[PDB]
RNA sequence: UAUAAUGGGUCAGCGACUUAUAUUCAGUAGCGAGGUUAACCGUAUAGGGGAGCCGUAGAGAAAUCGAGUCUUAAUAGGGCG
RNA sequence: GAACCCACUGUCGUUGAAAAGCCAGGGGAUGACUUGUGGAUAGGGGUGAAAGGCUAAUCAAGCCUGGUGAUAGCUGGUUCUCCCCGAAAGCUAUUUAGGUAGCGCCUCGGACGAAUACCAUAGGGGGUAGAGCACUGUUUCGGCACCGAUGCAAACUCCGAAUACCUAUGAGUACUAUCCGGGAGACAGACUGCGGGUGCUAACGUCCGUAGUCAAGAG
RNA sequence: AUAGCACUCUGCAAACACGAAAGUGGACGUAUAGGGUGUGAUGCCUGCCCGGUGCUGGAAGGUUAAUUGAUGGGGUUAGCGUAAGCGAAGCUCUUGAUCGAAGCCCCAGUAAACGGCGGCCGGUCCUAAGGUAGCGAAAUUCCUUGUCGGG
RNA sequence: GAUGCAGUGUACCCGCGGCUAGACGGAAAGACCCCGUGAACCUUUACUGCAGCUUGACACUGAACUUUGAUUGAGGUUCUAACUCUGUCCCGUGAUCCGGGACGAGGACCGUGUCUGGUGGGUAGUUUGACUGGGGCGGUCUCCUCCUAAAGAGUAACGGAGGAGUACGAAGGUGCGCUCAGCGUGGUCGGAAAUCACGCGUAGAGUAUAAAGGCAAAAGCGCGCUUAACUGCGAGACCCACAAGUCGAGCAGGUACGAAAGUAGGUCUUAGUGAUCCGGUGGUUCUGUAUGGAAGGGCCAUCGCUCAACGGAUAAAAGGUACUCUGGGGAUAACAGGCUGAUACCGCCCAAGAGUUCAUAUCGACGGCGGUGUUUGGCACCUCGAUGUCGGCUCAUCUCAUCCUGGGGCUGAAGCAGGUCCCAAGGGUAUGGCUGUUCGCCAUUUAAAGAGGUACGCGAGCUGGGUUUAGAACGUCGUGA
RNA sequence: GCUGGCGACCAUAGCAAGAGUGAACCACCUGAUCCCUUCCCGAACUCAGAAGUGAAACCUCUUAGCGCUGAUGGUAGUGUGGGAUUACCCAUGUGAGAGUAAGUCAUCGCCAGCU
RNA sequence: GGCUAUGUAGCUCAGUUGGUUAGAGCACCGCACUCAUAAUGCGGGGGUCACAAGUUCAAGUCUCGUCAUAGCCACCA
């Protein structure tokens, strides 16, 4: 007999809208567990780290900060 | 294991929460201020059992 | 499946998606914001019989309101229309 | 030890002379013996010196007629012709695993047309192949836990493609997408190439991903 | 199956069986008789265990049914009330004090009742107790065609 | 596992007597094995009923005395008139039934009706899960983290590794404030390691708990005040068969902490869970079967499941069948065939060494490469509307990896003998004791008593000792079948 | 041109060593009355100030010393079509990581004070 | 869930509704008796009466809860 054989449902993190796209005000940008992404401007984050967007325009990427942290921002 | 009880308000509305205690660490009777929405006042609370 | 998997020795005759009621959809005909009678009576497929049924208004558990209504302290927001 | 009552061995017979027999041998043969006539016990009952034996060639519950056209997610079968389109053997759940239900895939009617796809430009995230030793482990040889050379890794990473995927604009080609309704079938798959787990880098083995063919396709 | 043996039940309107009952067999019998159970002529015999389950005899302590219905709490309305509300009696819904048998729990006996007759490394532990006579590779022995003797 | 396909060989047309190697020959919708939310019968400390047996209350059921317990109860002794007699006598009557009459013996007992507790395989209806490289035994069944997973999401195996069925009124909120770990030095007990002070390189510490993704505005660590671990909502998205699940700016009310701009709808996040039905508790401007109430119901809040087989068939359920039965399957096992070749057997390569010296006359360690299709196995492609046998008998046919006989090379070959290798398939190649044996051991022979294939050749050619139906017994297991 | 504050950017920008500045600013500095503070301490936070100093600290300049950046060429991998099966070859498109040559002691904005 | 009963040294049995003002028998250790032993006799140690609270001049001894255990009974989401 094995003493192997679990696992877990899957929970389906990634990135929702990519670079360039267009959003209106609450849309889901990335889905997380940890900060990979963090919140640029026009950007909330949720309880479950859970990017999104607070505005309508259009999501760019980016690397800035002292540290290189990787964001993601909505323009107008 | 924490048991379940119920904090009831002291202004005779008969609103209610529940949640749960550790009675080992906690055998005095809660007490604590929470809103009371048919009155629509900050209130006090007071422990009673789960029944 | 040529299969060394099943069935048939051959011929002739018989042998299997029906009937009643209810309901929904599609054609077609009549009438049209209306349509239609059931049991029954009837020198009887006619003619009478309008009780009843479907449509014409929704919301709400309900009382209640009604082009609105429910939720709520709220004319805000939202759900069904 | 004959009659009579049994049935231990063997040959024959096995579409037999016979739905249990013939032949040659065998046991009991005044007894708990054999037999005629007429009666009694009836089906979850009878009877049994007991084998689940017998109860009309039928017995772990007789036969006949009714309930009755019992039920069967199982097996079989399903009858004239032509034209158009055309699948699946997947996911989820199930006292579920060869059944069924919703979704995916087919067909018909209505609405609506360029909202669709192929390709070219432009924008975007990645942690695989490869590689490396900066972390986690592991390895060899020198020097004094550290230093110098040297290897390895599905559950190591200082790095890191090709493809694939999402969005916007555009030429050309194409009956394309989408929505609302009627009817389904199917939920046993197989081999081959590529990337893999398992097995022995075995199997026309087994379990996934991806493409082609068969299934349902002749030359 | 059997003669023989043993246990147990049955005092007669017997126990027991058939039957719905009336009744019938047992038996026109009467414990030297009748029913059930096991063993199986005869010779020698038949060891230990009553902890389990069963049977037999006790106890009147705990628990417990129907029945009984003590108290307590609601509904209703005469009346009292400016009011809110209060509120007898009578009907009515509910609650459940007290009384209450056998059974079980408890205590003894019983194995020719059903059953049991050890484990571990001289001891140890645990049992209700740890196999007496007799026999033993057997209708029982895996290893196994055990070893020795005879043929 | 081919009369019928491909290549090729052979073969004029048709009977009769024989024979049984094949037509997976005929016969019986396989009885072994598995499946169906099939059947029957049997068992029991499976579930749930009932008959039977038994207990008490009330009724049939009455009269007198008495004793004893907490006004009632229990007890005892007498009596006759209900009731009993499968006791005697008389009559109906020519009658061992029955009825009436007279006695005698019992007697408010026994017995019967209704209610009620106990017992109850005697009898009846039923239940007794699924996955699964056949089934059983073992293991598993829901949730979370990593890999397999092929750089978006998703992705299986009885694939490789680990966790969960909680905790916390602060370990929640807010304002203000602070940096770990390690090492080297010095310094009472005090050391490897307690506490103190100072320097050096460094996130290697910590985050209630497993792992992963994270963590400087620290998401790590302290102090003061506190209850936003609020009520009504909610534009818009993620995920998705459904049922469910997740994130959320912003608006209104009340609030906490800040001078303030502001932050707060529990905790760094991802596990810590259970639908519907039936009921309980607190409220309520709903309903209220003539009317007014009330009972009951509705709405809002909340409580009771290891329903863990975790989308949960009932409130309530274990076994046997060799006495068996029906519907199906080569969707799935045992025999033989097939694919494969781990194992098995045979051959070769290298050669430490052994052989008085001498690797190779003969053996040959440590390692490597193949062949065959005999063994033990793996798979499940053919056959379950049947391919029906472990040995013996009879009769065979082929291979060569040769047992004898024939021809050779080398030798640690004096001769006789032997060892090893090469060529060779023409012929030949034991009888008995024991056991069902194949095999094996033993006795005695022979020039020799070879190794294999042929459905482990041959049962429509024979047998039937073994195994594997129904009877019976022993040991062992089970309460029992 | 020097000084201070706030940003853009986040190593070609950093670290390490060496040197320099007191007019102003900045820093060290004096005191603990009053505001305020230490789970003890005017060390830190805070107030009242000007006798001292540029020592420390901060800023500025020099250095390739560590670090960082980094070509060209080749190699590995790889989409499509073909040929093969230890997993490579051909046509076509694409193209790392490591290493080498080489580079680096940053570059900009707004406001205020001084020479 | 309802009703009862227990939990006293090293071991086991008492003390059971007030003034409990916890004992008895065996285990030990020491002493005495004996030529040496035992039995017996003496002495000492060995619990703080399941706990938590309540009335009280007196609480193991009574009342309340919480533990564990034993026995009977009841359980249709």
């Given at each position: 007999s094995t003493k192997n054989?679990?696992?877990?449902?899957?929970?389906?993190?990634?990135?929702?809208?990519?670079?360039?796209?267009?959003?209106?005000?609450?849309?889901i940008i990335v889905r997380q567990r940890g900060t990979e992404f963090h919140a640029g401007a026009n950007v909330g984050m949720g309880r479950d780290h859970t990017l999104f967007a607070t505005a309508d325009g259009v999501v760019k990427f980016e690397v800035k900060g002292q540290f290189g942290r990787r964001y993601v921002k909505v323009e107008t | 294991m924490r048991d379940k009880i119920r904090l009831v308000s002291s202004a005779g509305t008969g609103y209610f929460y529940t949640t749960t205690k550790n009675k080992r660490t906690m055998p005095e009777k809660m007490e604590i201020k929470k809103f009371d929405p048919k009155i629509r006042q900050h209130v006090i609370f007071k422990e009673a059992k789960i029944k």
């Open positions: 054989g679990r696992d877990s449902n899957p929970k389906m993190l990634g990135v929702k809208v990519y670079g360039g796209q267009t959003v209106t005000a609450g849309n | -």
